[PDB]
Amino acid sequence: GEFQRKLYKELVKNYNPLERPVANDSQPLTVYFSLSLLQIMDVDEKNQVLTTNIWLQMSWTDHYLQWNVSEYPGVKTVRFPDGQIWKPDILLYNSADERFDATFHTNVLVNSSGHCQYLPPGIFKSSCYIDVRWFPFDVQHCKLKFGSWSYGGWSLDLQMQEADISGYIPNGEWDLVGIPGKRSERFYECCKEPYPDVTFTVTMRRRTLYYGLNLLIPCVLISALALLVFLLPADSGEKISLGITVLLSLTVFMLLVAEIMPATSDSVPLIAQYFASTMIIVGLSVVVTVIVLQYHHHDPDGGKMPKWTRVILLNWCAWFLRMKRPGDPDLAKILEEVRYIANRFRCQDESEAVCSEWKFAACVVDRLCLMAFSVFTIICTIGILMSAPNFVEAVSKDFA
Amino acid sequence: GEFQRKLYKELVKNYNPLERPVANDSQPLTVYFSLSLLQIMDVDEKNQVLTTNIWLQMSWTDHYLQWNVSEYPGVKTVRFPDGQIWKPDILLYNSADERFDATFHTNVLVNSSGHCQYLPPGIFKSSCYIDVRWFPFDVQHCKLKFGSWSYGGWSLDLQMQEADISGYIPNGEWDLVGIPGKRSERFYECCKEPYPDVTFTVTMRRRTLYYGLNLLIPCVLISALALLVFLLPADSGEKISLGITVLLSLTVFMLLVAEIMPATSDSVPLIAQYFASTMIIVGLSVVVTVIVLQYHHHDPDGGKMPKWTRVILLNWCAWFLRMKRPGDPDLAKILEEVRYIANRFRCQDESEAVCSEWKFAACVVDRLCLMAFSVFTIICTIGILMSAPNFVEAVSKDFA
Amino acid sequence: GEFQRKLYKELVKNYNPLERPVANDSQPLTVYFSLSLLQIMDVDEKNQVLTTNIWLQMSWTDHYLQWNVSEYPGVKTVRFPDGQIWKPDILLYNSADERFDATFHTNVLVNSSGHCQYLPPGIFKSSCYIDVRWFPFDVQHCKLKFGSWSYGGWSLDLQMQEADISGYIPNGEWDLVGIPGKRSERFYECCKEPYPDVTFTVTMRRRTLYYGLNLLIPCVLISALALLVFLLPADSGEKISLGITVLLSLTVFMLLVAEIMPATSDSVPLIAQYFASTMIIVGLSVVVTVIVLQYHHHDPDGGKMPKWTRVILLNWCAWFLRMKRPGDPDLAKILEEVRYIANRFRCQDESEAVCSEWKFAACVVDRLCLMAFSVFTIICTIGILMSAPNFVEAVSKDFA
């Protein structure tokens, strides 16, 4: 329309997009900065990069773009594209993107009295420290530091406003706790003028159902199945097979859990501690199994049972678990030969009795070690799992 | 020729690409927004993004771009590139692309009356909630929300035309159900004006043939193979090995499925429920076979058959299972020797009889557990695979 | 020089790089389109995209860039950069690249008569259907569609020239069959004018040496080696281990093909069919192994071999495979002792005779199942691998 065309013609005349639009040059300009969180796109632990989808919200008061609505009755707002009017150079300080700026430049809406608005969208990839001390029951804080680049404290007075999360889209993996802001002034080696900035901290918790189902239960079940090696009779000859197969099935689980953890050498992750505990438990199980097997296949007439070991295993423990311990010249020549045969059979019987005693000792040792290892694995698993803070709150929220 | 040269020269005289091509500056400019789907490039599970090939469709009216075709014989349309005439700024609200506007800026075709046609293509990536509760029998609703970034409703009212699917090349994985669109107005606290926008919700159904044949069939087959551990006679001495090897080979499939799955924590997918159930079945089979091997290699002496086991295993279950249970002085001296040998044989016969009874008990337990486990695995697999809705429709449309 | 400087100054005076350079503004402008294939660098089956190195080729006639060479001694051609002269807007319709136009922009060579040439290179990513029904004996067709985005047929008409393949660098995986095309004229319900376009279909055939030597051969070898479980005497005690280990190994092997196969439910791939066949074979082999081991460790007391099974396994099949069937009162007390011992030994001999008969039955079953399984696997593998078309052509052109 004629009025809009005339207004656009008049506004740009003798306008310089390089000057700060203030009435008095000494007085700093006031800029209000806020944010509008929409979605946490990704939280990467290996690269420590947080990917978010937010809308910047900055508003100020231009002085030259003021007009009387009487002269132009139709038009009440004017929109200027990028590169025609002055805009604050607010940008992220700790960006991790290949290009340091990741804001899509949109139009700037202008009041009938100079109050400008600017709502650029964009997907921001910032760098924040990720803590894996209590994985996967951890809460992460990541900061977004915004501030003008080449404007001091006496030129651009940066103010702060509360972040808006009304349109937030809930994420499956993480649930948002809050996002408070803070404003501060800083000094730099470059210059002697303070540079204010606005910092937003995003506090989020990790939902633990997926990990608690695919990382903790299967390993516990496999360890419990490894504890069965202390029930197979020695004659089966499969205890070693069972032990090594379990060790392999946990080596592959070690690989799978290592594929995701970052190389941060600052703290030992909870899951790493617990997996290690399972490693040594299974290894000691294999060692005890070897000892038991070497007890069971003890060659008779090649040693004697030590008195201490005998009186311990066959009596003290047997009472403890109430397991009862098992158990004419031709005529003369014929006579002596049958005595020889009978004596051979008697020697065989004595050797069999000694072997039975050795096997019973092996069985008692096996039962004792089963009890000890079972109690040990329960106590260690429970202690490591419950050591982490907020564990009960997290499990209650995620499960019931 | 000279006619279109003169027309192009005179159409840009006192033209501002910053104004709104209206005639009263108090009547909103009507823009008709539509769509044209061509192909679904990708449906990412872990990233929760949707990649589609879309042509937009915008159409409005320009008041200044009008000419009499009588005075310009031959020319009926003109084309203007980007940045030369005013264009509506309509962009995808929810875009998962580092650049927030993935649109190729083509020309604008203008009729003599003044109609402007704009059809920019582009590969759009949008973030939508992907439901995984019913994997792989999935029906997903992903949304596309379009609207003007700056103009409101006093100036631009977005209408709708039905989304067109005519060049849509069918995808080999995702069936297309529909793509409806609704145009809704949203009011603000300030000003009683609408803010129209058009949203399109693509609805796709996942074809299940590939995932079925490659995941469901092999895991069911190996789970059935795990049941064969109940038919191997204990004397073979290789019963544990089959169980552990099956468990390992199936944990491999579990890792694969996990690597395909997202990491959400709002629900337990079907493919996770079924895998966990099969885990439990195989573990219970291993426990049972350890029990049976314990029964089989039972030392005859030093143990007695409990009353309960005697009164159950060999008489009740066998009847319920139709199992038949199997069961001078030199003369004196040589007499004592031969009677000693005979008594030795008598004792051996008694011991082997007791051992045979133990072995029969083991066989009975094997058969009973085989029947029980077969029934339980059939029931569990059928229940889990039939719980999901639209499963009958999925099989009907994919396997036949 | 000076003449070319003067000519450059004269050629751009009153010239609008926005109008179609025609002499009547009512007749179409003839534009010739052609291709030049250089190299095919990636055929991605997962996302069904094709990556090629292509030089376009356009030519037309401009009515404003003409001069008398005799007037400008020495100047015969003039090159204009992008954006300074009118160009046809021909872009590929079905692109799979984030930027819809992945074409480097070069200069336009202009002859003294007004002719223009334009050979812009660029790597094109195109979305085409990749049929996988007959992997890896595969022949693919992928289409490329080029046409004007905005100009119609009253103004622009394309004329095809034959695709040129002279610099085509052969690929190590795909051989080229040809690249034909056809001019097409789309008509509208609008009004009687064509909309010319040129489309090229690239035909390629996968070379099967690598896949034949890396997948089809090792899996056949493993399946054949699984048949050795039928030559292992049961006394070894390591029969089930061999079969289960072979099963585990090949189901691990299946991951390599699983990671290349796309998730298409249109048809069942040939390689997937053949792997499923090998799975059925190995599973049934393990089942038969369990049956044999059951038949071999048979209790001689509780059971007698049925008449039918005897007459089928001991004479009929024995002849059908030509295997022979293997095979004072002190004196009184002494007499009773010795006859007791003799009767005990006689009973032992009868028991071992029955056991030997059972073991022979197991051996006959094992031999018969070996023969049956060998025939079944060879027949199935040959049928599956020969069911594919152009299989003789593939094995004649790749291996030989």
Add this chain to the structure above:
Amino acid sequence: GEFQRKLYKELVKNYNPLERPVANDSQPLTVYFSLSLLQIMDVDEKNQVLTTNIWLQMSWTDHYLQWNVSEYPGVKTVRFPDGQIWKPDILLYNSADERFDATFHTNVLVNSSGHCQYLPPGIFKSSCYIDVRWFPFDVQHCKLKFGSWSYGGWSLDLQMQEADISGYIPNGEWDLVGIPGKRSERFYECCKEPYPDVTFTVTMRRRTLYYGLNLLIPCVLISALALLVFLLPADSGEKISLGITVLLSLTVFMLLVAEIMPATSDSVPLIAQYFASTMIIVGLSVVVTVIVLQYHHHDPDGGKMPKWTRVILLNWCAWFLRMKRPGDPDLAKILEEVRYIANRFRCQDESEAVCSEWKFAACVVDRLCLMAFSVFTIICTIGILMSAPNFVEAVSKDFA
């Protein structure tokens, strides 16, 4: 400075950055081309691409950028960015990059006499055929082709200056053998006009220490350890398990090897034709092991030993292998009893004496197969490894 300001103002007066800065418009402009290799970033076998780091060097002469130094005392050189002056358009004819021209555009240095220089750096990706026939002892020849895209031969004649490698940083896994070049001319069917071009063929050799110590040695060690199946006594009962475990480990090893090799079907790579040999060796090892286990667990009732087998195994080989080859009325009732017992014992002795020959035959065949496989695997591996060209040079340089 005033003088340089004046000169900058003068040099652009009436200067069209579109014309060849020649003096006669007839003779061509001689342009000198060269290169400056810095490092070889990566050589990709899978995609057949080469990424490098080079500095293009160009030089020519201008007829308009000349001035008298005595009139501008302080100025000797000037710099013009892209777009102000004429620059030759030289770019790779074979670039495997989405942008067909990856050169960072820097300034142009101009002397007082008019000479110009231009050194744009950039990371160049080129598509060169990469032979793989002799992996890992390989020598590659990748070509870079540079030439003007639009100017011909009467207008712009290239020259060649030998490539410069002085700041070259050696790669960790490639040895630069050289980088020659030569100038070639081409003609069209039009008219006798040379089309000069410059091409560089960088030749590189792969250092093989890492591959030799990572692949060749462990595979050989596993293959050699697979021969230990021929030292195990048959009574251990774990002769099969070692063979199958070796086969499984080497299958996963060959998958690890093949996940990096390109899928080319022009020739069989050395590493593949060596891994196939190892596969065949282990397969026949398992076959022979099955044969031995069949010969050893032979029932001494189902036939005899053929005379041919006797004379070939226990008569000839046993000598050749230098191994020793082992091997009152009641009185009548008592008589019958002892006669029966002794006859049973004699029958048992005959049976075991018969089985001893079968056990010896198994031992002899095992020794013979050990010798055969031990010689054959060594011969095969040494032939395959030493069959490659430049193997002696590779091993000498990379190990001494």
Add this chain to the structure above:
Amino acid sequence: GEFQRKLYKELVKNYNPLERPVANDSQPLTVYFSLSLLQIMDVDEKNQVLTTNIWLQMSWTDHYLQWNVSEYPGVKTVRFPDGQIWKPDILLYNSADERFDATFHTNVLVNSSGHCQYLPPGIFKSSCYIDVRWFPFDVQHCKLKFGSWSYGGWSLDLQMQEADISGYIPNGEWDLVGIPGKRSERFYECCKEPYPDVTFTVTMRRRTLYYGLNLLIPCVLISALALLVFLLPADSGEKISLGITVLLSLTVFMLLVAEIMPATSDSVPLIAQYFASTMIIVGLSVVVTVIVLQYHHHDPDGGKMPKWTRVILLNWCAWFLRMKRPGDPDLAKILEEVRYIANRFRCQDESEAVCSEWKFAACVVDRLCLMAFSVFTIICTIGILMSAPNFVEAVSKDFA
């Protein structure tokens, strides 16, 4: 601001950005260079690139941009965007980035006296040599070279200032040692002029609390577990499956290292040689186990046990290890029968004695090899891990 507008119009009147802002035109322009390090985001070893977050600190003096603050009350600074004033060109010479300059072009701050200030951030990807001969106890020195691309020493003398790490953010994987710099010159055969440059060398140390626990502890624990084959009695029958499965489980660590380790061939990494040593130890253990099994299941009637073997094993090793080795005519017919049976038992006893001797020899050789292998493995592990610099520093700084 009226004064701001007036000064902005005044400062760009006849100002050529192409000219150096000096007032003599024959003197160099002093430029102060520095750098501010924020984070070390990535240290890639496979591609040997380093990613850092860096600010530059360019600074110079402009002769033309001076004004009197008295005549412009209030204005103290002005900011110019890219392309409006002269900016020195400083490129990172060794840049492994697709774009040869990944710097965000921010504003230039100018004081009243004319001093400029340019601090453009950007994420840089330098290329450095990653020495890996001491993995994971590693210390690296990547360099960073900066310099003017087209200015020499007569025109631009580049000074240096110390780097700024006051805002450094620690990385969990690397420990920063320091970052020195050196401003050096260079001459040419042309003419005696310097070419100043500033080179920053980044020294970082890897923290090993992660690798030392994930690849150093599990490997040594598995190696120790591999020695249990010398405590397992041979009667078990599972004496070599343990070792072969330990080898199977050990291959995965090699694959993990290969996927982490680069492909360089200039040395052998410490961890690579350590794992090679461990696999050699395990293979030798398997060979020795085969020897023991062969010595244990020895045929008694197969050969006299060698005198050397006696005088070694049964004479010296028994003492050294302190182990004691185990250990009417009717009546005539009756006589003959009992004599036959008695002699049969005598011969059986002799065979048993020989077998027991052989078994004891096997046991003693097993004990001896256990001792030797344990000593060898501890010596090898300690020597390999301690034959590396800064190992004591690494442990005392990380594990404490």
